[PDB]
Design a protein around this nucleic acid. Structure first.
Ligand SMILES: [Mg+2]
Ligand SMILES: [Zn+2]
Ligand SMILES: [Zn+2]
Lengths: 589, 197
DNA sequence: TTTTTTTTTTT
């Protein structure tokens, strides 16, 4: 009854934020400057300003939304006439709806209402075009007339062809005219419920969502997203008569969120502590006793180095870690922790993986007999971390796919007439067991781990964990029992804060190596080569590839402390950890 | 509105090249020598010579492109009468269009406009034949009449047959006549975006 | 092509 365009338009112009900045007028600025055509409004902000406007949006969404969109378009038109003839429609998207429903708990009462669902994006289709206003021509020698068939409305989800010519009243043949046909961008994605919500003994459920217009290509597979929109029943084969009055539900997306100022302030305060590096290392797997050297290396892999593109070749910034340890050395516990704290990570197992599942799988579209690719584990981990457990138990045919990923950071696909090269810039963390149960110190690493030497040289660091009973057993027993009793360590950065800290560092920090750091690295290398030249009788090689690892590790240390330069201390720490690896593999100085 | 046919003809014959050599005349003569039927021109040269002509090409390529080809064809046959009876339709192609769109960035607003794409060829089908003007015969014991169904219009990409015989005004069964059907070479290729982008 | 269990030939 009461028009809400008046209260809405002044709400945009008059609204004060946390720091008294008038965000919405600032947000609407680049909407006309950069031609976004889409606006984002928080539900809490609208509710505080006027609850009547807020509750009208949730309930009467299908009616108030077109009215509100028209009001904002007029506001932009008077503010900048240049918007006309450029963008003819503006979308306003609402986020933060309190009505959040689990994927498994959707029932018939929620159809046609604005709801929000949290899940994981698993499938994305290529962008396509959908007709919303067609133009036909009547093929009848008398007629030769053109008209817009879905008059006075929009073309439904089912393409319907006119049966009677509206301009002559006769049936016959109608020809589509693509030149005058109106189109709109259209994409389809599949969302899956998070593993924490799956009940015992059940399999995860999936929901189909539709992204249209500017919402296309707003997310990548494997991302955790929050999606808001309207549920509706799905019609795909109306002509398939005969039983089956049962339909599936699909979601019509109106706004999507992936995964900000106070958090940035909190991150900066943490970096101010001189001992921030020690705090971060102590926060890695707090429930595991000892393994300080391994924890330090795992922290470096989370941040990584800086990739370099030379005149001819490319230098990866990712760090590869290989762990060999006796059974029960808590190898799998840390890898689970790493996969949970990293902003983007994929956890796999040697036995539960295949070559197609790791890189890309060809799927034949039985509906049209068409071939298309599906992203594998390594592709989904691009820009993140790939964790592989029990690498020694993987099949040889499935292991060769990893060889290219670690070396060239690429995956080559040539099958079913599809040829492509895929980026796989991901850090690889692998764990394995020795051949004969426990580890034999006297024998070299190569004959004690059951892996080809061609894959050993591709790892930046290798660590050996030995479970030898000794005087530390009492400390280990006391620590474990305290964990089972609920006792927790203090001064530990929590998972959520740690994940945000890593994401910020990987995005805004690019350390540069100073002259002093270069001299220390060079001097260590050349003196090591001279020492190694006397007697290079070790299973572990000392090739110039080790020099690149020293560069990567030093950059990671600087990035951990949010520093823009690599100083003497960072280079010194990188040498120490590299020196241990060059000697803990069974070879002395 | 303004007939650019004269402007196009003089532009080709009076194009100041790197040394005012009128290289367009040189390639036109080369085209006549080997019967190439395809003339390519640079958008920069057209814009420099007459920016108004360049805008019309890049904006109304659906309408004015056949007009320009007709003007070029008349000039070629006038220059050399032996070109007839060999090529009935010349081709003019534009290169260097400033409107460059990334393949992933294509949206609905770019449909029906002249754009350029950079990528990698992955698949190429063998050369085939496409019908652009068919001939049909009405199989109805009183007709025995032949006609070209797509009257005053090129045959659309969707093969459609007449429903009512135009010559006799009756429905029935129609048979295609391959011997009186116009054909054009047709090939399909797939382009893939570069891994860098 | 792809994962799976099965009998079969042939990688
Ligand atoms: Mg384990
Ligand atoms: Zn009609
Ligand atoms: Zn007839």
């Amino acid at each position: 009854q009461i028009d809400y365009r008046d209260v809405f338009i002044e709400f945009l112009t008059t609204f004060k934020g946390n720091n008294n900045q008038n965000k919405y007028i600032e947000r609407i600025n680049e909407l006309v400057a950069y031609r976004k055509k889409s606006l984002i409004i928080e539900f809490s902000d609208v509710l505080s300003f006027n609850e009547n406007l807020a509750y009208e949006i949730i309930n009467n969404t299908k009616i108030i939304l077109p009215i509100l969109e028209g009001a904002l378009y007029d506001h932009i038109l008077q503010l900048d006439p240049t918007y006309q003839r450029d963008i003819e429609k503006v979308h306003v998207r609402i986020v933060g709806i309190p009505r959040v429903i689990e994927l498994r708990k959707i029932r018939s009462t929620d159809i046609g209402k604005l709801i929000t669902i949290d899940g994981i994006l698993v499938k994305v289709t290529p962008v396509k075009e959908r007709i919303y206003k067609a133009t036909y021509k009547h093929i009848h020698p008398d007629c030769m007339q053109e008209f817009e068939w879905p008059e006075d409305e929009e073309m439904p989800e089912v393409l319907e062809m006119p049966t009677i010519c509206p301009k002559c009243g006769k049936p016959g043949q109608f020809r589509l005219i693509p030149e005058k046909t109106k189109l709109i961008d259209w994409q389809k994605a599949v969302i899956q419920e998070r593993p924490e919500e799956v009940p015992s003994g059940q399999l995860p459920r999936q929901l189909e969502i539709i992204l249209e217009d500017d919402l296309v290509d707003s997310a990548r597979p494997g991302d955790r997203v929050k999606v808001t929109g309207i549920l509706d029943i799905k019609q795909d084969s109306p002509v398939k008569r005969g039983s089956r009055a049962v339909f599936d539900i699909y979601m019509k997306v109106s706004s999507i969120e992936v995964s900000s100022e106070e958090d940035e302030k909190k991150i900066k305060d943490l970096a101010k502590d001189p001992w921030i590096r020690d705090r971060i290392i102590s926060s890695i797997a707090p429930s595991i006793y000892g393994h300080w050297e391994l924890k330090e290396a795992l922290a470096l892999a989370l941040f990584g180095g800086v990739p370099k593109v030379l005149e001819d070749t490319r230098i990866r910034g990712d760090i590869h870690i290989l762990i060999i340890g006796d059974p029960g050395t808590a190898k799998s516990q840390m890898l689970q922790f790493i996969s949970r704290v990293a902003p983007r990570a994929v956890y796999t197992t040697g036995k539960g993986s295949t070559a197609a599942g790791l890189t890309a799988a060809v799927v034949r579209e039985k509906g049209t007999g068409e071939y298309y690719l599906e992203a594998g584990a390594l592709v989904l981990a691009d820009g993140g971390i790939a964790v592989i457990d029990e690498i020694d138990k993987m099949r040889d045919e499935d292991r060769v796919a990893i060889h290219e990923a670690m070396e060239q950071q690429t995956v080559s696909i040539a099958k079913a007439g599809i040829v492509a090269k895929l980026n796989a810039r991901a850090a690889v963390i692998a764990a394995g067991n020795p051949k004969f149960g426990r580890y034999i110190s006297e024998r070299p690493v190569s004959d004690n781990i059951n892996l080809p030497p061609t894959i050993l040289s591709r790892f930046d660091l290798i660590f050996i964990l030995k479970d030898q009973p000794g005087e530390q057993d009492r400390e280990l027993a006391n620590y474990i029992l305290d964990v089972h009793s609920g006792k927790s360590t203090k001064n530990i950065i929590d998972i959520d804060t740690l994940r945000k800290y890593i994401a910020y560092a990987r995005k805004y920090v690019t350390p540069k190596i100073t002259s002093e750091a270069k001299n220390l690295i060079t001097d260590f290398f050349v003196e090591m080569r001279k020492k190694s030249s006397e007697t290079p009788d070790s299973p572990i090689l000392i090739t110039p590839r080790q020099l690149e690892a020293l560069i990567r590790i030093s950059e990671a240390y600087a990035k951990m402390a949010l520093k823009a330069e690599v100083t003497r201390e960072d280079a010194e720490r990188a040498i120490n950890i590299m020196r241990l690896f060059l000697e803990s593999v069974g070879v002395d100085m």
